[PDB]
């Protein structure tokens, strides 16, 4: 999708945990994940505890991308939900779309992606670190 | 930018406390800083050399000033065998009354520390007799440190920074070092000995006001110019000289009697000046070797490029070694540390074997402390040389420059080298531990006659070949009417034989089966430390588990838990592992030296000879027995002057113990603990208004290994030094 | 009279100097661009 | 931020992308193997450096390589 | 504690040689050895030992002595477990021998 | 710089390894090697046939002649180098 | 015995050395 | 003799150690009634101590100033009862063990399941190689001359360096 997030999506019913985001989420960086459910059931939170996911649409704020992707892995390998979307909320109310970027999962091939970081030789043909001395660059 | 690691943009953007630790820890790594060129690197190293030299001379000037001001040099000169030398006076507002009376010792009336560095004997030999002389030496070294600091400031100026071609001038630098810094300095020391120290030993008072009008020899430059150099050797000091006075003295300035002065139990001062003169001439001739500006001389590149055995025995010979050494500061530094480590181990052996300072080999505390000092420093330099060789392999070794070189062939057959070091270490460890455990069980079962006691016949044969005549080998120097015993029979032999065949010297101590076993233990330690260091240096560029190790640098945490697990895989981790083994083998060497000399000084060498063959003998006769004056420095009934040594003993125990924290527990546990503490501080009232600037994180893996190793080493040193000082002080023998 | 110099210099140096150096070093650590 | 590189010994078996916990890796089209795809690292700023991709590579001496470098608030995995 | 408990009560266990309590002194020394042997596993890491095993495997391969069951270093969890077990065995053995040799002889 | 002194692909070193004596023929090198060896062995034999004393019997001519024994090693090596080079 | 004037002279020389050490350290600079 | 050592048959400290060793057990003997197996065990210990000391005196061992035998690992022929003859014995036995292991390794490599032949040993074949390794210095020399003992060196795996 695009960089838009519905702030009024209902949240899973949770009793409050001591694992939530700290002061550096309203200051630096915050993440949210939204998914669609078919029934009311109980899932384990990545910040400990258990929460009931609402039937319909859900929204949940986390502190790092690892927590959102671990929750997405739980929503995949368990009871099948595969339309989750992970965002990144800045303190100036600016949202950025991260997971399912091109609309499809990264493991499936998608025409229109550009290879980044690809190297045109085997790993044993990197230059020696003597040849990059006093240059600032590296042999990667 | 304005952030603290101005030299590392990567570290300055770290939002955590890791930035401060890594900025402190990588301050001197001048090769990896941001925007560093070779010329600027060499200039900064030159300035740092000047600053470090100034630090050395300031430290020596401080020693001189404190002995001059708060010392008892006046009283110690008049009676060296009974007056305790003084380091400095103690100022402590934490002292009680009984600590003030307990530390009030020597001839002074204030609390005071007794010097165990032997600076009193050294200054007493070289002509110091009053506190004014020490104060003037302190002033001279202060002015020298000031001059060196100004020179270091001056050579970073834009018109005084030397170019890169000046630094890589190997022939000129080695010529000037070998001639000047060695030979001319040795010649000047021989001149000082002959002009000041030898006349001061004979009762004359030679200082800056009368040295230019007092002849050191009665003739004076006439035997030197005419060629009758043997006139300087006639009439030596008789064996009734009494150091510092004139009865039985001589008028000789260059002799080679050999052996020891009979009263001071040290070598003759005329032997030392002659030795320095010979070394001076040899070093000037040796510095007359390399071509600098006048056609004659060698080129170091041609010598290295020529030395190829005829049919591929050593590959391409030493071709390309000149380019690798000059362009890599890590190889030069590694060679320097290896040579210096050999040198300081040599000084450790020779200063107890052949003492040169008057009235040492009778203090026994300076004698123990200096040996342990120099042996630990030797171990440190030896480990550092291999560490910098590993660094040179990581980021300075060019494989195309060294094609089929004598250095690349070392990497070609590195597996054979590591496997054979493994075989030697395993063989030595198996056999010496088996012999020690066999002797333990045999002594424990009431049958000490079943012990395996190998007589060390090779080293005893060497002692006999040097002249020792109780083993009955009757070979070379021990047997008269031999070519070796006749050829030197009228130069240095009689003094050497009267010094080696007496029982009061440390020259070639009598050795038995315990010496055999502990020498095998020492060889085990040396081979295993060499194993770890050589394996790290040779596998620094890669192995089967990590073929691209050179891309990740010299020091990195790991390569993940994949393909089995890659804990401690870098060459830095090989250094970290070999540090423990160096500490272990230096502890073995110092334990052997200290117990052997403790039994010899007390006239009870049979105790060592009987109890050194099994481990329980060591444990109950050296460590348990000699700790009694140390741990009783303070108790429930009071305290004495060894309370500070007891406190430092427990201090070293605690530091060595808290090293095991960082060495055994690893980051994850501590990172989760830090996160819980972060929640605690952020979610408590009153105290959450105080906010950190750097986010607290756990110590990194390499940082943790370094911190635990530094703790281990500091605790090691601070628990061995109080024992080796207080046990010798608590027995006086 | 040189019997005052320990009791003057040792507290001044050992206490006052590294405290000011710690404060100055901390301030220089935490200043930014 | 750490730097991730993928070399041409890739076989396109997708295990590195599945093993990634930070959505760093993705599959782009390619013609150098039978699967017709090669791994890519377009989001290396979200790399934490846990090297789960390197454990999942089946090729002899892994094609996807993670070099630990500069540390940020994302590569340190800090929630505070 | 150090002077009046450990140093003062180890006299029975260090002087037990040549008597009926000499096994306690033997176990004292052996448990010290095992406790120190634990720190080898507790401080070091797997990758160094794997590379050293590679260097040994080269010589074995050279002499046609390579086992088909390929030799590997102990795993990280196993290395920690071995170090901990050796540490506990050495400590409990040292305390066991010290207590028994002290309290039997007084 | 310097000269190409590497000879790993040849059975003998080039003549330029001798520096200032790169043009001396092999016969002079061998004759001087034998003479220097004989004189040096005689000079060092004058230190064990006669007991060298503290200043009385030192005889600095025998000392200067004693340096011919290591010099005789270099002369017979240079004799071989010039012989293989054809000079 | 070392007089007070000698100790103060040594202190002055050490102070000059300290100022030069500061100059060298700030010539290498941070 | 060698290193100033005296023979143990001519050493007074060795005899003093003999007397102390037998006197300790004799003092231990005085609290037991005769005919009891404790008494018989203690007198057997005394006889064993006397026999051991007599053997150490008769074998020609050299004792030092402490009265304990000192082994001369020099290689002299008169001290070949020390290190050298046990050296030859151990070298033969260790070569036997190594050659038996190597032969079974070759056999297990040449089979269809090399891994299962090393955790579960083929006992008849293992006993065959184990007993046939008695001529290891000849078989190893024959394999060395035939070129089967050593791999050429370009066929063993090596780290990149
Ligand atoms: C004759 C002229 C001369 C002299 C005297 C020196 C002297 C020095 N140069 Mg130097 N240099 C020269 C010409 C000369 N240079 C030239 C022509 C060049 C250019 C080609 C250089 C280029 C150069 C560089 C690039 C550097 C130096 C450095 C140094 C210093 C070495 C550090 C030191 O103190 O070691 C002193 C060491 C000894 C006196 C001997 C140590 C070895 C022995 C075996 C020790 C044991 C002796 C004895 C037993 C000790 C016991 C004493 C007592 C405790 C009992 C030293 C002051 C370095 C330095 O520090 O820079 C400031 C440095 O980085 N020089
Ligand atoms: C014709 C050749 C010849 C010969 C055979 C001699 C022989 C001798 N001269 Mg002599 N001399 C000569 C020409 C000669 N001179 C000339 C042309 C002059 C200048 C006018 C001098 C000026 C001279 C002086 C000023 C002195 C002698 C002395 C001596 C005697 C020293 C003996 C000895 O063992 O030296 C001792 C050897 C050494 C000290 C070291 C030997 C190593 C070499 C030979 C040193 C040579 C100098 C050396 C290069 C350093 C000088 C460099 C300078 C810049 C510092 C000896 C009999 C000395 C003497 O007492 O005479 C009775 C003396 O003081 N000579
Ligand atoms: C003449 C000797 C000499 C010189 C010039 C150098 C120079 C260098 N070494 Mg080095 N080294 C040496 C000796 C030397 N070393 C020895 C003897 C060892 C063996 C112990 C080492 C081991 C070593 C390693 C393992 C490494 C270096 C590295 C380096 C480079 C960067 C230094 C750095 O970042 O430190 C900055 C300064 C510090 C980190 C200060 C740390 C303070 C230490 C830990 C002591 C603290 C304990 C303290 C005294 C306790 C107080 C006790 C009290 C409370 C009682 C630099 C080129 C590193 C490098 O860049 O290589 C690629 C590297 O990895 N060296
Ligand atoms: C007391 C503690 C201790 C002991 C005994 C050892 C022992 C050993 N370490 Mg070690 N190490 C230790 C602490 C210790 N370490 C610590 C604290 C560290 C810091 C992390 C290290 C770091 C370290 C490194 C980095 C290396 C070693 C290596 C070695 C081996 C050296 C070879 C050797 O001596 O073989 C002798 C073997 C032994 C002493 C083990 C005991 C074996 C048995 C029980 C001996 C019994 C005697 C007798 C033969 C019995 C007959 C057997 C019977 C069946 C017939 C050996 C296994 C090196 C290695 O593996 O190279 C090959 C090596 O590279 N260690
Ligand atoms: C590095 C050598 C060195 C060392 C370790 C010491 C150590 C000591 N001095 Mg001292 N001192 C030294 C050199 C040294 N001195 C020199 C050269 C002088 C002549 C000016 C003096 C003059 C002096 C006096 C007059 C007094 C001391 C006192 C003391 C003691 C208390 C500390 C103090 O207040 O110092 C204060 C010291 C100074 C103000 C002089 C500066 C010391 C040198 C020049 C600095 C060297 C720095 C060194 C290289 C380390 C650099 C790194 C550092 C920045 C971390 C302490 C034992 C006091 C004492 O006796 O207490 C019982 C005391 O009253 N010192
Ligand atoms: C022990 C090793 C050794 C060896 C093999 C040599 C060999 C050589 N040196 Mg030599 N030299 C040595 C030690 C040695 N030197 C020492 C210790 C010094 C210091 C005194 C010198 C100082 C020296 C100089 C100053 C010169 C030589 C020169 C020469 C070459 C010319 C010899 C000739 O043809 O004589 C006929 C010859 C290759 C000469 C040469 O050709 O330079 C390349 C030359 O000018 N050497
Ligand atoms: C019979 C098998 C056998 C043979 C011939 C060898 C031969 C060799 N090993 Mg070795 N090794 C073996 C088994 C064997 N090993 C085993 C099982 C281990 C694991 C514990 C090791 C661990 C090992 C190390 C760590 C090192 C060697 C080294 C060496 C070489 C030097 C000799 C030495 O140090 O021996 C010492 C041997 C040992 C300490 C291990 C002995 C263990 C037992 C007693 C042998 C196995 C017998 C086997 C069970 C018999 C079953 C066969 C039967 C069914 C017929 C040599 C090539 C060293 C080297 O590389 O030097 C170049 C070296 O550093 N080996
Ligand atoms: C007039 C004599 C005639 C016979 C001799 C002779 O001419 O044969 C020459 C010859 C063969 C030949 C010939 C040819 C040249 C090939 C062809 C000739 O035909 C012609 C002209 O073409 C014929 C022939 C047969 O001659 C071969 C020569 C071999 C030679 C000359 C071999 C020297 C080793 C030196 C060593 C090992 C030094 C060790 C030195 C040592 C160990 C030391 O320096 C110790 C030292 O303590 C010393 C001593 C002094 C101290 O300061 C320094 C120290 C402490 C270190
Ligand atoms: C890592 C590395 C490195 C390092 C290395 C090292 C550290 C080494 C060491 C080495 C060593 C540490 C060696 C040693 C040696 C020694 C010797 C070589 C000795 C000799 C001696 C002699 C020869 C003597 C003889 C004699 C005499 C004369 C007297 C009498 C007796 C007798 C006979 C004994 C480097 C940087 C280079 C680079 C590369 C890498
Ligand atoms: C005389 C004597 C002595 C000496 C000795 C010596 C010095 C020796 C040496 C030795 C040596 C120097 C050796 C070397 C070697 C080399 C090699 C190279 C080897 C090898 C081996 C092998 C290879 C083996 C193999 C095998 C077999 C055959 C069997 C088992 C199995 C195996 C496979 C392992 C002494 C004094 C002690 C004492 C007296 C006597
Ligand atoms: C030494 C060591 C190894 C190497 C250890 C190995 C390969 C264990 C070898 C097991 C042997 C083969 C079991 C039998 C031991 C001896 C053959 C028998 C000795 C018997 C005595 C009682 C005499 C690791 O793999 C390791 C891994 C992680 C952390 C630390 C370490 C570690 O310290
Ligand atoms: S995280 Fe720790 S245990 Fe795991 S590979 Fe890295 S260093 Fe080894
Ligand atoms: S290091 Fe971790 S986060 Fe980065 S690409 Fe590999 S698996 Fe993904």
């Amino acid at each position: 999708t695009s960089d838009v997030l519905n702030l009024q999506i209902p949240t899973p019913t949770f009793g409050g945990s001591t694992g939530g985001w700290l002061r550096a989420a309203e200051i630096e960086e915050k993440y949210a994940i939204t998914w669609t459910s078919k029934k009311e059931q109980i899932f384990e939170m990545p910040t400990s505890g258990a929460a009931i996911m609402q039937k319909g649409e859900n929204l949940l704020y986390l502190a790092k991308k690892e927590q959102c992707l671990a929750l997405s892995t739980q929503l995949r390998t368990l009871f099948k939900i595969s339309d989750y979307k992970i965002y990144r909320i800045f303190p100036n109310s600016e949202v950025q779309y991260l997971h399912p970027k091109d609309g499809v999962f990264p493991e499936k091939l998608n025409e229109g992606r550009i290879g980044v970081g690809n190297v045109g030789y085997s790993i044993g043909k990197n230059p020696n670190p003597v040849n990059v001395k006093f240059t600032g660059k590296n042999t990667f | 930018a304005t952030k603290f690691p101005k030299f590392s943009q990567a570290l300055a953007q770290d939002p955590a406390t890791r930035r401060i630790w890594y900025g402190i820890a990588t301050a001197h790594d001048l090769e990896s800083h941001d925007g560093m060129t070779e010329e600027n690197l060499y200039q900064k190293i030159f300035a740092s050399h000047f600053g470090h030299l100034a630090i050395i001379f300031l430290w020596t000037s401080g020693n001189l000033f404190h002995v001059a001001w708060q010392g008892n040099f006046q009283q110690w000169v008049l009676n060296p065998l009974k007056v305790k030398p003084i380091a400095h006076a103690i100022w402590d507002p934490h002292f009680g009354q009984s600590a003030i009376k307990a530390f009030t010792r020597g001839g002074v009336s204030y609390p005071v520390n007794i010097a165990t560095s032997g600076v009193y004997h050294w200054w007493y030999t070289v002509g110091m007799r009053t506190n004014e002389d020490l104060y003037f030496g302190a002033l001279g070294l202060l002015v020298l440190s000031t001059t060196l600091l100004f020179a270091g400031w001056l050579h970073l100026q834009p018109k005084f920074r030397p170019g890169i071609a000046w630094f890589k001038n190997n022939e000129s630098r080695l010529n000037h070092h070998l001639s000047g810094l060695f030979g001319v300095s040795s010649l000047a020391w021989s001149g000082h000995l002959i002009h000041v120290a030898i006349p001061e030993s004979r009762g004359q008072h030679i200082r800056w006001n009368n040295f230019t009008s007092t002849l050191p020899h009665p003739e004076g430059l006439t035997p030197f110019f005419t060629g009758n150099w043997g006139l300087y050797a006639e009439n030596p000091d008789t064996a009734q000289h009494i150091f510092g006075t004139s009865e039985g003295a001589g008028t000789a300035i260059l002799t080679f009697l050999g052996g020891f002065h009979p009263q001071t139990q040290s070598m003759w001062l005329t032997d030392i000046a002659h030795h320095h003169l010979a070394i001076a001439v040899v070093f000037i001739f040796a510095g007359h070797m390399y071509r600098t500006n006048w056609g004659i001389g060698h080129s170091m590149k041609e010598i290295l490029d020529a030395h190829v055995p005829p049919k591929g025995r050593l590959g391409a010979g030493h071709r390309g070694l000149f380019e690798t050494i000059t362009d890599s500061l890590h190889m030069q530094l590694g060679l320097a540390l290896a040579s210096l480590g050999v040198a300081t181990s040599l000084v450790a052996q020779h200063m107890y074997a052949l003492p040169s300072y008057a009235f040492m080999a009778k203090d026994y505390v300076t004698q123990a402390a200096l040996y342990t000092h120099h042996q630990y420093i030797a171990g440190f330099l030896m480990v550092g040389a291999f560490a910098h060789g590993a660094i040179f392999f990581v980021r300075d070794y060019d494989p195309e420059v060294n094609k089929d070189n004598v250095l690349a062939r070392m990497l070609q057959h590195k597996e054979a080298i590591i496997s054979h070091l493994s075989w030697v270490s395993l063989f030595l460890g198996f056999h010496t531990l088996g012999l020690y455990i066999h002797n333990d069980v045999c002594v424990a079962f009431g049958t000490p006659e079943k012990q395996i006691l190998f007589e060390p016949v090779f080293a005893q044969f060497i002692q006999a070949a040097s002249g020792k005549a109780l083993y009955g080998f009757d070979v070379l120097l021990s047997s008269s009417t031999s070519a070796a015993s006749v050829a030197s029979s009228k130069i240095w032999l009689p003094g050497w034989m009267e010094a080696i065949n007496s029982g009061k010297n440390s020259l070639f101590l009598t050795i038995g089966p315990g010496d055999f076993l502990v020498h095998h233990a020492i060889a085990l330690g040396l081979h295993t430390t060499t194993l770890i260091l050589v394996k790290g240096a040779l596998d620094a560029r890669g192995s089967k588990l990590m073929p691209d190790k050179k891309d990740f640098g010299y020091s990195f945490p790991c390569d993940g838990p994949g393909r089995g697990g890659t804990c401690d895989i870098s060459a830095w981790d090989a250094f970290y592992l070999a540090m423990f083994w160096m500490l272990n083998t230096i502890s073995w060497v110092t334990f052997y030296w200290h117990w052997k000399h403790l039994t010899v000084w007390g006239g009870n060498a049979a105790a060592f000879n009987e109890s050194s063959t099994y481990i329980m003998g060591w444990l109950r006769d050296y460590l348990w027995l000699n700790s009694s004056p140390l741990i009783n420095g303070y108790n429930a009934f009071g305290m004495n002057a060894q309370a500070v040594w007891a406190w430092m003993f427990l201090f070293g125990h605690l530091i060595w113990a808290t090293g095991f924290m960082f060495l055994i527990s690893w980051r994850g546990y501590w990172q989760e603990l830090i996160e819980t503490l972060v929640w605690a501080h952020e979610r408590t009232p009153i105290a959450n208004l105080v906010k950190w600037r750097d986010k607290p994180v756990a110590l990194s893996i390499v940082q943790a290994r370094l911190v635990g190793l530094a703790h281990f080493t500091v605790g090691f040193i601070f628990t061995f030094a109080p024992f080796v000082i207080a046990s010798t002080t608590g027995k006086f023998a | 009279s040189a019997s005052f110099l320990p009791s003057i210099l040792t507290p001044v140096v050992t206490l006052v100097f590294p405290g000011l150096m710690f404060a100055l070093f901390f301030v220089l650590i935490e200043q930014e661009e | 931020s750490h730097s991730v590189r993928v070399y041409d010994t890739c076989i396109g078996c997708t295990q590195c992308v599945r093993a990634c916990p930070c959505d760093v890796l993705e599959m782009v089209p390619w013609d150098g193997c039978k699967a017709g795809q090669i791994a890519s690292a377009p989001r290396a700023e979200d790399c934490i450096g846990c090297k789960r991709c390197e454990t999942a590579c089946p090729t002899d001496f892994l094609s996807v390589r993670v070099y630990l470098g500069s540390e940020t608030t994302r590569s340190l995995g800090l929630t505070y | 504690w150090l002077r009046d408990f450990l140093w003062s009560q180890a006299s029975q266990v260090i002087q037990s040689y040549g008597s009926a309590l000499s096994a306690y002194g033997i176990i004292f020394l052996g448990a010290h050895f095992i406790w120190a042997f634990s720190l080898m596993f507790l401080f070091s890491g797997r990758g160094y030992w794997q590379e050293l095993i590679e260097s040994v495997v080269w010589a074995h391969n050279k002499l046609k002595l390579a086992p088909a069951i390929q030799p590997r270093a102990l795993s990280i969890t196993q290395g920690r477990a071995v170090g901990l077990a050796h540490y506990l065995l050495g400590g409990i053995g040292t305390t066991w021998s010290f207590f028994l040799a002290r309290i039997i002889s007084v | 710089e310097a000269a190409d002194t590497w000879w790993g692909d040849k059975d003998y070193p080039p003549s330029i390894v001798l520096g200032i004596g790169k043009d001396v023929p092999s016969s002079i090198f061998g004759v001087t090697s034998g003479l220097a060896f004989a004189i040096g062995v005689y000079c060092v034999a004058q230190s064990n046939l006669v007991n060298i004393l503290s200043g009385s019997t030192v005889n600095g001519f025998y000392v200067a002649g004693a340096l011919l024994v290591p010099y005789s090693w270099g002369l017979h090596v240079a004799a071989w180098i010039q012989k293989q080079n054809g000079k | 015995m070392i007089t007070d004037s000698q100790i103060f002279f040594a202190l002055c020389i050490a102070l000059t050395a300290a100022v030069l050490a500061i100059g060298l350290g700030r010539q290498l600079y941070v | 003799d060698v290193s100033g050592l005296t023979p143990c048959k001519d050493s007074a400290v060795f005899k003093k150690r003999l007397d102390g060793s037998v006197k300790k057990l004799q003092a231990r003997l005085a609290n037991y009634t005769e005919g009891t197996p404790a008494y018989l065990a203690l007198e057997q210990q005394i006889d064993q101590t006397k026999a051991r000391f007599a053997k150490y005196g008769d074998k020609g061992l050299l004792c030092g100033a402490d009265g304990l035998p000192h082994l001369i690992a020099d290689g002299r022929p008169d001290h070949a009862g020390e290190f050298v003859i046990p050296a030859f014995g151990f070298l033969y036995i260790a070569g036997w063990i190594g050659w038996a292991g190597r032969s079974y390794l070759q056999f297990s490599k040449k089979t269809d399941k090399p891994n299962e032949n090393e955790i579960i040993i083929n006992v008849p074949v293992a006993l065959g190689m184990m007993s046939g390794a008695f001529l290891w210095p000849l078989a190893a020399w024959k394999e060395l001359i035939n070129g089967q003992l050593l791999v050429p060196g370009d066929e063993v795996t090596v780290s990149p360096r």
Side-chain angles (χ1 to χ4, degrees), chain B residues 54-56 58-63 65-66 69-70 88-91 138 142, chain C residues 4-14 17, chain G residues 7 10-14 17:
Chain B
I55 282 179
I56 282 184
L58 266 170
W59 159 73
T60 306
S61 81
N63 279 329
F65 176 79
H66 267 291
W69 181 30
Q70 303 159 315
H88 68 298
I90 303 174
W91 190 84
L142 271 158
Chain C
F4 302 126
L5 275 184
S7 169
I8 288 172
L9 287 182
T10 315
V12 164
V13 171
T14 309
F17 177 68
Chain G
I7 304 177
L11 281 176
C12 290
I13 300 184

Side-chain angles (χ1 to χ4, degrees), chain B residues 521-603:
Chain B
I522 286 160
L524 171 62
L526 294 196
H527 291 84
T528 310
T529 307
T530 310
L531 189 156
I532 307 152
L533 285 168
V534 164
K535 182 206 150 305
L538 292 179
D539 274 329
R541 286 181 65 82
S543 51
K544 304 294 293 187
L545 191 51
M546 212 171 159
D548 63 352
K549 202 188 296 181
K550 56 184 169 65
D551 305 355
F552 285 76
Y554 171 65
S555 176
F556 58 95
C558 84
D559 210 6
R563 59 201 191 278
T566 46
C567 317
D568 275 313
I569 195 167
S570 54
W572 192 95
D573 303 303
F575 155 79
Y576 150 77
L577 289 176
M579 261 294 285
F580 296 100
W581 257 100
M582 173 265 297
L583 290 168
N584 172 62
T585 180
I586 298 302
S587 64
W588 285 352
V589 172
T590 50
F591 285 158
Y592 173 36
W593 193 96
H594 188 210
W595 193 19
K596 186 147 189 72
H597 273 82
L598 268 180
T599 54
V600 173
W601 292 331

Side-chain angles (χ1 to χ4, degrees), chain H residues 3-20:
Chain H
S3 300
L5 305 176
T6 184
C8 301
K9 61 178 188 174
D10 297 329
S11 171
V13 179
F14 196 65
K15 306 172 185 176
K16 194 181 63 177
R17 285 195 182 272
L18 188 154
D19 291 331

Side-chain angles (χ1 to χ4, degrees), chain B residues 45-46 49-50 53 57 122 166-167 169 172-173 176-177 179-182 185 340 343 347 357:
Chain B
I45 289 161
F46 200 46
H49 286 185
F50 273 116
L53 208 60
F57 284 116
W122 173 35
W166 184 81
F167 284 105
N169 203 338
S172 180
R173 187 164 90 222
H176 292 87
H177 280 184
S179 52
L181 185 64
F182 280 75
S185 304
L340 282 177
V347 304
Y357 302 136

Side-chain angles (χ1 to χ4, degrees), chain D residues 5-80:
Chain D
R5 304 280 180 272
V6 180
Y7 297 88
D8 65 348
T9 52
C10 168
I11 64 177
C13 83
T14 305
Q15 303 306 324
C16 83
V17 176
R18 312 180 184 278
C20 167
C22 286
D23 201 19
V24 184
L25 302 155
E26 73 179 9
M27 285 277 131
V28 306
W30 191 49
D31 61 312
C33 58
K34 293 174 72 175
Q37 40 189 12
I38 191 180
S40 166
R43 289 173 290 277
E45 69 269 5
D46 278 302
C47 181
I48 51 174
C50 69
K51 288 171 178 284
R52 280 190 200 173
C53 73
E54 300 180 1
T55 318
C57 180
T59 64
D60 185 13
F61 203 49
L62 53 86
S63 309
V64 61
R65 191 47 139 173
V66 178
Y67 308 93
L68 299 185
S70 301
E71 304 279 348
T72 54
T73 180
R74 295 181 193 168
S75 80
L76 279 170
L78 294 187
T79 66
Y80 52 91

Side-chain angles (χ1 to χ4, degrees), chain B residues 182-254:
Chain B
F182 280 75
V184 176
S185 304
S186 182
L187 176 62
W189 184 248
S190 178
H192 162 76
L193 282 171
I194 289 156
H195 271 259
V196 177
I198 297 183
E200 281 286 339
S201 69
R202 291 159 175 173
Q204 316 182 13
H205 189 245
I206 306 302
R207 291 298 175 266
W208 286 116
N209 47 5
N210 53 359
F211 79 108
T212 186
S213 68
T214 313
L215 263 69
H217 193 70
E219 321 282 324
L221 261 64
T222 304
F224 179 78
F225 279 147
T226 47
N228 276 23
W229 292 357
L231 293 179
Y232 292 142
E234 282 169 52
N235 191 22
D237 287 326
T238 67
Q240 282 90 5
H241 172 39
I242 308 299
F243 199 88
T245 64
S246 56
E247 64 270 15
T251 48
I253 55 168
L254 303 160

